[PDB]
Structure 1
Amino acid sequence: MNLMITLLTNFTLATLLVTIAFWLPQPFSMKFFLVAITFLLFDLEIALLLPLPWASQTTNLNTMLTMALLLIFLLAVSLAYEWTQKGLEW
């Protein structure tokens, strides 16, 4: 409840800022869309990667090393696939 009270105080102070600021002075491109989903899939593979340092202390290191490098290898494979198959070109 500590950080919730801090969040509440900051929200109330910001709303007081807005009320003093206001009540007191009285088509597309398809090539845009590939950025969002490509970011989304890179960020999902980030979500797969990022609990890696918690696993840095167990009795399995070779299998973990090989599969983690396999995951970044596959991320680079997807990168090279869209990189060579005009997925991000202009």
Structure 2
Amino acid sequence: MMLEFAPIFIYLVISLLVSLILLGVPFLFRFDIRFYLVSILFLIFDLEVTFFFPWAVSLNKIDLFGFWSMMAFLFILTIGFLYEWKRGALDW
């Protein structure tokens, strides 16, 4: 079932080789704090997107309980996002 990653690895190797060939073609002849806040928001919402993936696929087995568990999870992160909003961390 995991046999479909060998083509991807060979693809990576060959893309490496062709990129090296392309590079070899011409050879033959202060601090800002908002940049940290955006990364923090990305980390949080990337974890949230990670937690969606099992939920979306397995939403047919779980029913009206997993849905509401995910809804409570989203409600908590939405309160967090609202706190993120009113504090001006989303403005530039």
Q: Please give the TM-score of this superposition, normalised by the length of structure 2.
A: 0.78
Whose relative contact order is higher, 1 or 2, with alpha carbons under 8 Å and at least 6 apart?
Answer: 1
Relative to 1, partners in 2 of residues 1:41 and 1:14: Cα closer, same or farther, differing over 3 Å? same
Unmatched 5+ stretches in structure 2 = 1-5
2: CA distance between counterparts of 1:86 and 1:5? Answer: 47
| Deviations 1:30-84, CA, capped at 9 Å, x for gaps | 12221111111111111112221221222x3111111111122222211111101
SS in 2 for 1:62: coil
The equivalent of 1:63 in structure 2 is 65
Unmatched 5+ stretches in structure 1 = none
- 1:41 aligned partner, one-letter code: I
Number of residue pairs aligned between Structure 1 and Structure 2:
87
Q: Please give the TM-score of this superposition, normalised by the length of structure 1.
A: 0.80
The equivalent of 1:79 in structure 2 is 81
% identical equivalent positions: 26
Aligned residue among 35, 39, 49 for 1:36: 39
